[PDB]
Design a protein around this ligand. Structure first.
Ligand SMILES: [Ca+2]
Length: 140
């Protein structure tokens, strides 16, 4: 409907709503997975936060070779304040938005959109592994 744009010039004292929404959409197990993904994205971070190189890195793996300008525009476009860099807070809400955004935009008969979120997630996980639970005994 109207929602809320301005921060009310009153930082902190809330933010609980954002966390609550994430919890409702993301489960405890899912939340842990999210953190794991964040750590991977944080790896190689020039400024400690996702950048053109980080985003470009995954693009190369997908077989895509986007220009530096394209990556910069994408970050600025998705950026909350257009700072040009996505921080932990911005990254967290960004992921949540993409989740509900995709759900909202479905209607019927989808179209080949670059890559699917599920496909990317599966690629990150690669081969299934549960040897973590069993260390002394190896069963595969
Ligand atoms: Ca930003």
């Amino acid at each position: 409907h109207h929602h809320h744009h301005h921060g009310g010039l009153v930082p902190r004292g809330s933010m609980d709503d954002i966390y609550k929404a994430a919890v409702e959409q993301l489960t405890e197990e899912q939340k842990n997975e999210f953190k794991a993904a964040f750590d991977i994205f944080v790896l190689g971070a020039e400024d400690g936060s996702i950048s053109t190189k980080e985003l470009g890195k995954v693009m190369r793996m997908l077989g895509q070779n986007p220009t530096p300008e394209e990556l910069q525009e994408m970050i600025d476009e998705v950026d909350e304040d257009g700072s040009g860099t996505v921080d932990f807070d911005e990254f967290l809400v960004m992921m949540v938005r993409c989740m509900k955004d995709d759900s909202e935009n479905l209607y019927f008969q989808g179209r080949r959109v670059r890559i699917s979120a599920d496909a990317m997630m599966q690629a990150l996980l690669g081969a299934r592994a549960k040897e973590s639970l069993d260390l002394r005994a190896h069963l595969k």
